[PDB]
Amino acid sequence: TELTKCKVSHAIKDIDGYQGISLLEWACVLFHTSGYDTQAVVNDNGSTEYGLFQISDRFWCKSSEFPESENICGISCDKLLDDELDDDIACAKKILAIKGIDYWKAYKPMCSEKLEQWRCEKP
């Protein structure tokens, strides 16, 4: 499903400030990472990135295609393709804590400035 900036924003409130990354930065990153599409699937270089956070099956989640990675997140990759964002968020945090924000390449180039635009005034 294609979510809106505000929908995404309200769903991830608990990642706010985690590892230093604010809500505004995440809203930006996510826009440039999956276009808010909870079902985004991008496969290249022999690995597949899934969902809103584009979490890869190379290390993080278990996919039938690449059946035995470390599955650091402890979740089936198909779980990152529904509209229930809790596990996705739970996984992303592991990524932030282990690898950091640079996992998300959209971050440095598109989200280093003009952040105010990313804010969601909707309660």
Add this chain to the structure above:
Amino acid sequence: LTACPEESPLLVGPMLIEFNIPVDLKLVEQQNPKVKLGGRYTPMDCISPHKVAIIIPFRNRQEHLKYWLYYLHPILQRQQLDYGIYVINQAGESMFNRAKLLNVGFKEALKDYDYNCFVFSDVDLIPMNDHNTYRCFSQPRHISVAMDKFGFSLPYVQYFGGVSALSKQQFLSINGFPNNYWGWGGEDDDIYNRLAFRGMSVSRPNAVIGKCRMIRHSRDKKNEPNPQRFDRIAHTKETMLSDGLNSLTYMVLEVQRYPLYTKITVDIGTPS
């Protein structure tokens, strides 16, 4: 005989835009009797200072092109522009390369007329308010500002993809667009960094006048998300100097003049 006025008296404002009905170019051709071979038109009532070449990057999307021509032609004529339509068909099986094809369009269009303004338009974006003039201004112009795909909103302030207009000066000032973006994503952002690095600022119509509809379509397996875009958009400052108009090479395999448009199939090579 006298210069066309600032604002066209032919404008209607908001238009209903739908892709439910099938198009018949012959009908389209009929309805637009003033369009000459090649997709050219020149207001005969007044003189437009806007000599506009419209460039459409393209590959196996003839259906979109139909709607594009069906809606765009009546609008552009109403906006009183002296224009020309150019579809830059990419031959081959290499990933889509939008920016490059836009570069080809610029060069090829010039061979036809003394154009002073270039509008770069994806084949699937249609303007919903003829007040969003498809021409050039004192600064680079972003046109697909309120696309329905983005909730009739500007998704991000640095967004320049979709449909835009640069004057020859403006386009020439940034060494045109890059040639090394194969696949989806980033090139329109790279173009944005250029306009910025050259001291220009982006101009846009308000979110109401800039409403646009986009014909949705199944993902293109020949335009997969470019894995290198994240690194490439970070070096424009350096690369706009070596990759642009000055480094453009391509081979024209065919030039087709249809009554409503000029189609140029080219071989722009492979991801070098």
